[PDB]
Design a protein around this ligand. Structure first.
Ligand SMILES: Nc1nc2c(c(=O)[nH]1)N[C@H]1C(S)=C(S)[C@@H](COP(=O)(O)OP(=O)(O)OC[C@H]3O[C@@H](n4cnc5c(=O)[nH]c(N)nc54)[C@H](O)[C@@H]3O)O[C@H]1N2
Ligand SMILES: Nc1nc2c(c(=O)[nH]1)N[C@H]1C(S)=C(S)[C@@H](COP(=O)(O)OP(=O)(O)OC[C@H]3O[C@@H](n4cnc5c(=O)[nH]c(N)nc54)[C@H](O)[C@@H]3O)O[C@H]1N2
Ligand code: SF4
Ligand code: SF4
Ligand code: SF4
Ligand code: SF4
Ligand code: SF4
Ligand code: SF4
Ligand code: SF4
Ligand code: SF4
Ligand code: SF4
Ligand SMILES: [Mo]
Lengths: 734, 193, 250, 250, 193
């Protein structure tokens, strides 16, 4: 009866639990993965796994998981939920026929491609360029990381990347700004943070909320929200004016340090304490203590940075403090991350190629005379990255030309992009809207044609390359064959690619054919790659290794400390003076803060019975004294109403103090209105449905979300089905 | 011959239920029940704010009140210190549930009583328990209490403080909590409101 | 205060089992009546033995029909082992052997005073095991030592209350003495608890408790209300302590 | 384990306060017989009302005689303050109002048989208070919840034992019924304690304990052995529980 | 209106009995009885030997079991948290000695119950207790718990750990043992045998 006493088959497999992509071993018995585990050699898991990685396999064995292609009954509205089963052949023909029509009267740029996850390489990076549309985007760019990637390209000549390059093991003093570690549960960084604490690493947390990471800190600074750049500028001032900075380091690796000293003249710990609300002595003491530890003192940059409209300025300032401490490329906090060598599969150049910009004209030069039609959000902000949230307007008004047709490859249209009403207007006006997914979410059931993808355990994917201290390559192999009428994304892309004239792209007849070519290059074949799941190569991490060779890394030959001559010129400001006092909540309201549950990924894990049973609903955090003046207690429920009248389903109230009186906090990803995902339907409040407005970062395409205010209205406890009853439905592969 | 135990460092625990999900998976524990869960409690106002994250599961008590009270002989204590159930003798009378002071046991839907097993299935073939292997923070340790080299023995030797739940029942738990966050010790519902 | 997953702190003994608790009281106490009758050589000793056998059969049938392992057929182990430290083990052997002993008495086979003293000892084991099945759980604050006093006295009010409805003349006086004892100890019970446990009993029950205390006072009033009132007070009190005492609580 | 000075862990209630425990059993038990004999109309209601007045008065003298505070005359405060949380306070009034009430009944004046209802209530307070004066101390492991049951059962064994020696026809049967209830709870008591508390009880007393249990089995044999054997058993157990439970112990 | 308390830092107590003798002289406590005494216990075996020196006395509990039990009203709890006896109403019945969990109470040879008094006689003239005054090791502190300038308040804040005798009882002891020498906390006789 037990699975481990029964016959098993293992395989080396990547976790699709989230984008960290940990290397794992999957244990199957017949057509079912019972257990998954981390493995030692793999630099990401090293034998361990977070809760999301452990429970991730049940979506494959979920009775509501999508099985057949589906096409929208003719004459029925998008939203209304009327579908009829179809054949892979019939559904794939129907999409190409429709796509070709949009291309004869509008051009190929009238098709937007949105996507996320491993297979976003096919849908967002490859298919779109081979087809000729520049309107390809992912939420991890303008709804996450854009502010810090832009700041980093200008200041250093490098990205921060997916596996942020912090030398945690040698760090001695660490400053976290809104970075919640322990709730944000990315595997390796949990391990590393825990090892730092263990060796006597003292941690300072800056956050208006007493989080899990603050529960492990030597100092908690309860900062007034949207005020971090004033605290960063005043620390820059203390290290420059009290003469505590690393003199040599600035002298040999830094351009324009002088502009910074003069800029920061009046931003004193007394000017900061006034806006920040942190005492001036504390502001001083924290900068001194970090100077006393250099180069082994780090402010690691957080991942989610869209917070307010000014964002690229706050990150630039955080990076200057790291530079002034002399820590970049030194053991203490930043090693230097090099990408591995795995040669691309040989092909003709793509109609559109990318521009990994940073200096000397990376905006619209190739978009003006260069061939025929630029990405539709081209004049809205300074930076060159595509912003998912800005290409939605073109579908409603037809402004910058028209975008009829849209693809959604594993990306939550109604939970990951703000202003849900505007996104629904835009789907209304489209000629074609295709969605490739696994569960019947609220935005998948608005599509003309639904295509069921095969899950990470029943699928092969192109390799996963990770820039790192020791660069590496990972490979995922099926643990068993797809279920029902399910197909892998590499297969769905090639099948559409042959139907739209792109045979030169997609020549190879199979994915193992494709995988054998890149393994030839390195000195191996498919069977040997399956043997050592992961491959580590030689690279570099300090400055010495670079230096002795007579080279340096960057952008232009010396990190430019103020940081970018060509923005200055035509945009306006060079330095981060935009501490820009933030608009405040109206009386009777609270700022809406949000974040992660250690056990749930974004939105997609809310139908998972193993994970919902650990955390079945979110809970609103209000200060103890506010819930008391309001007439709220421990087990009460409440509706959240925003400044624009939108109400979000009943949520449990959480009157325990660990938060300022200015705010309120809820975990992101609950509040689904999707009846077909039977255990996620009707539970908690959705933060995204309340985020009606956003402040556009004019520098890094980012949509500032922490600009919404919400008030609480007493509500009745909800009457919902039993979760155990639903979780007990047996899984039948029919 | 060994005396089996588990040590959890609370100074490192962050309450990401990884261990709780790994056990659910490894042991096929049905939907409405749990061998392992995490409790989280805050203590105090503004300038002295402590948060305690605490995993709870069978403590494999050395003096288990859950054994003598069983009519059939299904409930038994092993020579190495493991408390287990022979489902072949279990009549699902619930006497052991009435007697356990830690809400560690349940009625499995197959008709018999269940609970944390110290992964006896893995122990017998020389492996460490599922909770212990999957743990980002490395706060749990396991071993023979009598071997000065084992990971639990070392962990206890290096600890600033050691605590156990409801020590005044006289069960002698073999799941030890290290370096508790609050000066007054493990958190109780009675020290609230 | 907050959890990931949940502790297994839900009710383990249901309305179903509380019923078993009222019944084994009746069963055991009627087997005591049949034993003491055979011992005085009184003529009614024969049919009281039939009844104690019937109530023993009805109680073993609902102990089995309510067991999650009712079709796994594992109760045989109750009888192939020796567990002297376990109240439920004592209870299985007292009733069981008390049903054979009372079986031979009915069939005039295998002796007759030496079988009446045996029925006396097995019926004291069966009257004694319920209060101890509760009371040995020193982790449950409401199941204190008095449970070993409240359960035996209450099983007697049930048997004598039944005997008096069947119009047996000897029993309406012992029923009033034993019902006075039970109601006095039941009234002093809450005063024997730590503050937080008494407050827990009062919030979750009481009003039911206080109603069962009043009820039972009708055992000293009108002649034919006296056995009903005494029966319902003694059964209500037994079931209420079984459902309300399944708490560990700090 | 070693001290400079010493904790005040010395016995606080001596053999003289164990003697009062036995007499207030009698005083309260007989006062119950008296009111019931009144209420019932019985010819003997007078004989037993003047006995209860002597037993009550003998006890209240032994209560002042054994107090180190006697010649300081501080007892007047027992009757000039309101203290409902105190078992001992409830016994001062229960035996005081129980005295006046029994006076106004023996001197046939004031009022009749509305006064026997007040004597019944005050006797229940006097029967209830010792048992709770011990059980209220939750720091003493041996004095558990069963004390609140073992003391009122045992006080009526004392009253009915006396009554049966003064040859009253009614007394023997109820004495052998309450003596069975008393002796069965007394047997279950040790099985109710935690292992260290029980171990302490069996090494300190026990023999003495198992002697008085055996001795009490004598109420169910002959006459003029019966009232004696049940009377020595009830006073044995009462005095020994007061003496052996003054332990705090870890 | 304040909340009176005593703290004893066990990392500094050497168990010389100075406080105990200073008490006996001041309050002229009679032969055979003690308001204050010292308890010394070893927790053993060579590389790991630990000795706990612990002074014991009335903890002036915030929820005293010795008050409610008194028939006379001589046992009263004050507005600032001192448990005292008025000998004028005392009938020397011992109910309070039976309800005290700590052996802090005795029968005075003058016919009334006595115990430590938090040096009430000195507190009104604005002085610190006699035991607190004589202490050579500076390990005992006193004051109002609610005033943060108080020597008890500052010491509680500086302690690495805080403990109390029989917390499982109802009482809320207002005598706090600071830095306990054994990792498992305050020493108990059941933990020996
Ligand atoms: N309001 C708000 N918006 C946010 C955030 C927030 O905190 N609040 N966080 C932002 C951040 S930081 C990020 S990184 C993004 C992430 O945004 P998303 O990745 O869009 O988030 P999810 O909610 O997991 O949506 C995943 C979708 O992909 C589907 N899916 C899952 N696995 C597979 C697979 O193997 N194949 C296919 N075809 N589909 C699959 C799921 O069913 C679901 O429809 O969202 C951003 N948006
Ligand atoms: N379990 C789990 N872990 C995950 C994910 C998941 O879905 N599930 N997703 C991953 C991804 S893609 C991302 S992007 C991250 C998201 O996680 P992070 O990158 O760590 O996000 P932050 O927004 O920095 O941190 C959230 C904290 O920011 C605080 N905050 C709000 N406003 C302010 C302010 O004005 N100043 C300061 N100093 N703090 C503020 C909130 O109080 C909260 O405590 O986590 C990742 N890890
Ligand atoms: S961080 Fe956790 S959820 Fe994400 S891929 Fe790794 S194991 Fe899976
Ligand atoms: S896996 Fe580690 S961090 Fe997670 S609950 Fe268990 S002990 Fe705590
Ligand atoms: S439920 Fe099963 S294991 Fe527990 S006491 Fe009964 S027979 Fe034994
Ligand atoms: S933790 Fe529970 S199952 Fe384990 S010995 Fe203690 S009472 Fe028994
Ligand atoms: S040791 Fe075994 S029973 Fe206990 S939590 Fe780990 S896997 Fe579950
Ligand atoms: S003065 Fe200090 S060391 Fe001496 S007995 Fe008193 S508390 Fe102990
Ligand atoms: S001895 Fe004195 S202070 Fe103590 S309970 Fe009796 S009257 Fe009250
Ligand atoms: S320690 Fe004892 S005598 Fe002192 S106040 Fe507390 S309960 Fe009363
Ligand atoms: S406070 Fe006064 S009475 Fe109490 S121990 Fe110290 S000197 Fe003695
Ligand atoms: Mo993200």
């Amino acid at each position: 009866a037990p699975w481990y006493a029964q016959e098993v088959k293992s395989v080396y497999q990547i976790c699709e639990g989230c984008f960290w992509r940990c290397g794992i071993v999957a244990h199957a018995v017949g057509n079912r993965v019972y257990k998954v585990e981390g493995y030692e050699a793999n630099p990401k898991s090293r034998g361990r796994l977070c809760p999301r990685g452990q429970g991730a396999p049940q979506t494959t064995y979920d009775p509501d998981r999508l099985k057949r292609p589906l096409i929208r009954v003719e004459g029925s509205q998008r939203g209304e939920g009327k579908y009829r089963v179809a054949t892979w052949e019939e559904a794939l023909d129907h999409i190409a026929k429709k796509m070709l029509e949009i291309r004869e009267k509008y051009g190929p740029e009238a098709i937007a491609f949105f996507g996320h996850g491993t297979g976003d390489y096919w849908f967002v990076d490859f298919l779109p360029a081979a087809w000729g549309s520049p309107n390809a985007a992912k939420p991890s760019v303008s709804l996450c990381t854009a502010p810090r990637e832009v700041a980093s390209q200008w200041v250093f000549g490098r990205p921060i990347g997916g596996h942020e390059p912090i030398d945690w093991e040698n760090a001695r003093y660490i400053v976290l700004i809104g970075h919640h570690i322990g709730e944000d549960t990315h595997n390796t960084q949990l391990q590393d943070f825990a090892l730092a604490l263990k060796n006597g690493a003292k941690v300072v947390v800056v956050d208006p909320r007493f989080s899990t990471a603050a529960a492990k800190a030597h100092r908690w600074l309860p900062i007034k929200p949207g005020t971090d750049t004033a605290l960063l500028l005043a620390w820059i001032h203390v290290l420059i004016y009290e003469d505590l900075y690393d003199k040599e380091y600035v002298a040999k690796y830094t351009v324009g340090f002088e502009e910074l000293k003069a800029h920061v003249k009046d931003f004193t710990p007394e000017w900061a304490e006034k806006h920040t609300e942190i005492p001036a002595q504390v502001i001083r003491e924290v900068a001194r203590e970090m100077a006393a530890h250099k180069p082994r003192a780090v402010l690691p940059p957080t991942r989610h940075n869209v917070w307010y409209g000014d964002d690229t300025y706050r990150v630039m300032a955080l990076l200057y403090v790291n530079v002034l401490l002399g820590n970049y490329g030194r053991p203490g906090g930043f090693y230097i991350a090099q990408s591995p060598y795995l040669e691309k599969y040989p092909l003709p150049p793509l109609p559109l190629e990318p521009a990994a910009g940073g200096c000397s004209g990376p905006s619209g030069g190739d978009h003006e005379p260069e061939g025929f039609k630029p990405r539709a959000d081209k004049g809205k902000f300074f930076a060159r990255s595509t912003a998912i949230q800005e290409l939605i307007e073109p579908m409603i008004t037809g402004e910058p030309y028209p975008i009829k047709g849209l693809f959604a490859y594993g990306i939550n249209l109604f939970h990951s992009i703000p202003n849900v009403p505007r996104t629904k207007e835009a789907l209304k006006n489209l000629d074609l809207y295709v969605a490739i997914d696994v569960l019947p979410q609220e935005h998948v059931m608005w599509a003309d044609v639904i295509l069921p993808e095969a899950t990470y355990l029943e699928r092969y994917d192109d390799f996963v390359l990770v820039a790192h201290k020791t660069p590496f390559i990972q490979l995922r192999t099926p643990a068993h064959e797809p279920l029902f009428d399910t197909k892998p994304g590499w297969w769905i892309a090639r099948e559409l690619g042959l139907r739209l004239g792109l045979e030169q792209y997609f020549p190879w007849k199979t994915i193992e054919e494709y995988l054998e070519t890149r393994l030839q290059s390195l000195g191996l074949d498919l069977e040997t790659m399956k043997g050592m799941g992961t491959l580590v190569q030689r690279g570099k991490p300090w400055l010495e290794d670079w230096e002795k060779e007579g080279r340096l890394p960057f952008g232009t030959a010396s990190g430019k400390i103020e940081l970018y001559c060509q923005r200055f010129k035509e945009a306006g400001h060079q330095p981060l003076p935009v501490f820009t006092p933030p608009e405040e909540p109206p009386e009777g309201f609270y700022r809406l803060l949000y974040g992660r549950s250690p056990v749930h990924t974004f939105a997609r894990t809310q139908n998972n019975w193993v994970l919902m049973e650990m955390d079945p609903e979110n809970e609103v955090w209000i200060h103890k004294e506010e819930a008391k003046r309001l007439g709220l207690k421990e087990g009460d429920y409440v509706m959240l109403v925003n400044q624009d009248g939108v109400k979000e389903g009943p949520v449990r109230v959480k009157p325990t103090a660990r938060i300022r009186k200015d705010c309120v906090y809820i975990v992101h990803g609950f509040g689904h209105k999707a009846p077909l995902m039977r255990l996620a339907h009707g539970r908690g409040a959705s933060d995204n449905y309340l985020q009606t407005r956003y402040k556009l970062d004019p520098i890094s395409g980012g949509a500032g979300l922490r600009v919404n205010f919400v008030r609480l209205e007493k509500a009745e406890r909800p009457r919902l089905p039993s979760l155990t009853g639903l979780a007990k439905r047996p899984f039948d592969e029919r | 011959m060994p005396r089996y135990a588990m040590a959890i460092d609370l100074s490192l625990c962050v309450g990401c239920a990884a261990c709780a999900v790994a056990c659910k998976m490894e042991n096929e524990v049905p939907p409405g029940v749990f061998n392992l869960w995490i409790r989280e409690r805050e203590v105090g106002e503004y300038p002295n704010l402590v948060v305690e994250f605490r995993p709870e599961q069978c403590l494999h008590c050395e003096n288990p009140p859950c054994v003598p009270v069983c009519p059939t002989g299904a409930s038994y204590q092993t020579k190495d210190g493991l408390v287990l159930v022979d489902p072949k003798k279990c009549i699902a009378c619930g006497a052991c549930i009435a007697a356990c002071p830690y809400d560690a046991r349940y009625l499995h839907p197959a008709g018999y009583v269940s609970k944390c097993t110290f992964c006896a299935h893995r122990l017998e073939k020389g492996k460490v328990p599922a909770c212990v292997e999957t743990c980002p923070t490395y706060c749990r340790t396991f071993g023979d209490l009598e071997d000065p080299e084992s990971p639990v023995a070392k962990a206890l030797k290096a600890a600033e403080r050691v605590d156990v739940l409801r020590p005044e029942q006289g069960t002698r738990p073999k799941l030890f909590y290290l370096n508790a966050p609050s000066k007054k010790g493990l958190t109780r519902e009675s020290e609230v409101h | 205060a907050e959890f990931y997953g949940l502790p297994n702190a839900q009710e383990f003994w249901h309305w179903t089992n509380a019923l078993h608790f009222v019944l084994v009281g009746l069963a055991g106490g009627v087997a005591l009546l049949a034993a003491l009758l055979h011992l005085k050589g009184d003529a009614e000793a024969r049919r009281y033995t039939l009844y104690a056998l019937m109530l023993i059969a009805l109680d073993l049938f609902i102990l089995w029909a309510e067991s999650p392992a009712r079709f796994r057929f594992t109760h045989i182990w109750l009888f192939l082992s020796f567990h002297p430290t376990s109240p439920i083990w004592w209870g299985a052997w007292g009733l069981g052997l008390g049903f054979l002993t009372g079986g031979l008495l009915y069939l005039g086979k295998g002796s007759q005073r030496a079988l009446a003293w045996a029925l006396l000892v097995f019926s004291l084991v069966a009257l004694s095991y319920p209060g101890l099945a509760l009371a040995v759980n020193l982790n449950r604050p409401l199941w204190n030592g008095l449970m070993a006093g409240l359960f035996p006295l209450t099983a007697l009010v049930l048997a004598l209350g039944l005997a008096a409805l069947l119009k047996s003349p000897w029993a309406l006086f012992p029923l009033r003495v034993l019902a006075g004892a039970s109601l006095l100890l039941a009234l002093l019970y809450p005063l024997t608890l730590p503050p937080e446990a008494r407050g827990h009993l009062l919030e979750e029950a009481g009003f039911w408790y206080g109603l069962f205390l009043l009820l039972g006072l009708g055992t000293f009033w009108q002649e034919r209300l006296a056995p009903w009132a005494g029966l319902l007070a003694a059964a209500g009190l037994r079931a209420l302590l079984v459902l309300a005492g399944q708490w560990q609580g700090l």
